[PDB]
């Protein structure tokens, strides 16, 4: 409760008055494969903040220029989903967690 960052503002959000538990454990030898597991994505930016226990689910190409990009992400037209690159040789703090 009462947190800020990528995950707390553009993803899963907890109310201030939380009445439960949080459980996390490392799963390096379960999710990190050679070459990078490109199966876990996180929203990079968003116009505003999510409501508590409310989740945006869809995506659109945000146009931040003057020309109407036709559904193609290039310059001044961004796709708001970046993926993790979990590899077994990374260090703690960048390894997958559940």
């Amino acid at each position: 409760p009462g947190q800020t960052g990528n995950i707390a503002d553009y993803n899963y959000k907890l109310p201030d008055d939380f009445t439960g538990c949080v459980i996390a454990w490392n799963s390096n030898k379960l999710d990190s494969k050679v070459g990078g597991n490109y199966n876990y994505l996180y929203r990079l930016f968003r116009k505003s903040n999510l409501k508590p226990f409310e989740r945006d689910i869809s995506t659109e190409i945000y146009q931040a220029g003057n020309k109407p990009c036709n559904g193609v992400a290039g310059f001044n037209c961004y796709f708001p989903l970046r993926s993790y690159g979990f590899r077994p040789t990374y260090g703690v703090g960048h390894q997958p967690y559940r």
């Epitope: 930016f45 116009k47 931040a64």
Partner: antibody
Framework: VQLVESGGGVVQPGRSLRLSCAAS????????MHWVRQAPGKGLEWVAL????????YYADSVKGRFTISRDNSKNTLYLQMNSLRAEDTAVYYC????????????????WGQGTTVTVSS | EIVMTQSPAFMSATPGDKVNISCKAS??????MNWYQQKPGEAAIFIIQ???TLVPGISPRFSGSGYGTDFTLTINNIESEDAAYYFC?????????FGGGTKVEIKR
Amino acid sequence: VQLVESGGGVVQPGRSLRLSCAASEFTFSSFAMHWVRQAPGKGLEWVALISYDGSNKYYADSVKGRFTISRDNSKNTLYLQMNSLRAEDTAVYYCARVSYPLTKYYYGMDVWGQGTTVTVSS
Amino acid sequence: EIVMTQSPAFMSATPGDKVNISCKASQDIADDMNWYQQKPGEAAIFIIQEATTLVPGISPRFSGSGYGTDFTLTINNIESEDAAYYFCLQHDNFPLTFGGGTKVEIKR
């Protein structure tokens, strides 16, 4: 996409100056802005950072307490105010744009400017 | 304050050969650096993002590699317009710090 800045010039030590950076062909209000500088014969040095709304302002230790960063979204302008200038402030100043929009936790830069010269001499 | 060391400071480029530029960090940063090129008289150009991705619009001759502490920018098939000022920037934690700088010149 273009960034144009001006307002530099020669000024006596201890006085004040204001630099203005102008943006065009892109949404100025959705991006964060960087002020950087490079002294003659030396590498570049980061100076200041401002968010896309103006709530968060970050300064460097050497220029803390003397430089003020601000923005005007209606006029698409970025302002830097310099007070109590000393001999170490003679450099070339650059105005930079953050790569991603509507983000308060990314700091990469992709678009720069040509620069302006500020000379602190009497 | 992460100190970034860039080498070499000055290099001579024989056309057709390859160039490696080394950027090193005192601390550990993971894919949190960019490579920029600036020719004299104009603005800088965004060349390499996060040490691996090549920015669209740039020639595929440039490449980058490295993770953790050491990073290498590699240029192949040097041509006469590759003479510029290259620098490596880290954007991990405040304050942001740049590299030293490398000047490449053609050889005759």
